[PDB]
Amino acid sequence: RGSHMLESYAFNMKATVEDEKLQGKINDEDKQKILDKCNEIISWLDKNQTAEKEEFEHQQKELEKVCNPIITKLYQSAGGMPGG
Amino acid sequence: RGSHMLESYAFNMKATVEDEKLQGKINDEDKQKILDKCNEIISWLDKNQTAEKEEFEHQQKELEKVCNPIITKLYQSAGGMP
Ligand code: NA
């Protein structure tokens, strides 16, 4: 989807650098550079995805925080429909 | 996603207030303000999708910048004729 391809990819590089196929074929110094860097992105998603949920839950409140007082107005006033 | 619910709410709350002659509402201002905010989210939501999008393509790039050189180095050593 985006955060998936990215993530997926990351999982797969590690998936490589760790394969016994390169026990010594890949620079032992290099294994680091990836793994680490891959995790960097791994975490960077987990963290960004979680931070997202908040800006969501922060707009959801500051939204109804405008509606509920009018709902709880029209709902007090005669008529009262709101039930989508 | 909880982003849906947000959308949903914004999307419903916006139409459930445009519905029809449900003008029992202060169907003029104290409704106008339910439109502005609602859409404010409708948009801000969007501006974030295409905001996240990028950051992903970004990080996705940065990680290759740390892998391409190495996988290239790999595709250069196990031949039987090359
Ligand atoms: Na006023």
Swiss-Prot record, chain A:
Transmembrane segments: none annotated. It is found in: Cytoplasm; Melanosome; Nucleus, Nucleolus; Cell membrane. Acetylated. ISGylated. Induction: Constitutively synthesized. The modification N6,N6-dimethyllysine is found at residue 25. The modification N6-acetyllysine is found at residues 53, 61, 65. The modification N6,N6,N6-trimethyllysine is found at residue 25. The N-terminal nucleotide binding domain (NBD) (also known as the ATPase domain) is responsible for binding and hydrolyzing ATP. The C-terminal substrate-binding domain (SBD) (also known as peptide-binding domain) binds to the client/substrate proteins. The two domains are allosterically coupled so that, when ATP is bound to the NBD, the SBD binds relatively weakly to clients. When ADP is bound in the NBD, a conformational change enhances the affinity of the SBD for client proteins. Molecular chaperone implicated in a wide variety of cellular processes, including protection of the proteome from stress, folding and transport of newly synthesized polypeptides, chaperone-mediated autophagy, activation of proteolysis of misfolded proteins, formation and dissociation of protein complexes, and antigen presentation. Plays a pivotal role in the protein quality control system, ensuring the correct folding of proteins, the re-folding of misfolded proteins and controlling the targeting of proteins for subsequent degradation. Belongs to the heat shock protein 70 family. Component of the chaperone-assisted selective autophagy (CASA) complex consisting of BAG3, HSPA8/HSC70, HSPB8 and STUB1/CHIP. Identified in a IGF2BP1-dependent mRNP granule complex containing untranslated mRNAs. Interacts with PACRG. Interacts with HSPH1/HSP105. Interacts with IRAK1BP1 and BAG1. Interacts with DNAJC7. Interacts with DNAJB12 (via J domain). Interacts with DNAJB14 (via J domain). Interacts (via C-terminus) with the E3 ligase STUB1 forming a 210 kDa complex of one STUB1 and two HSPA8 molecules. This is Heat shock cognate 71 kDa protein. The chain holds residues 542 to 620 of 646 of the full protein.
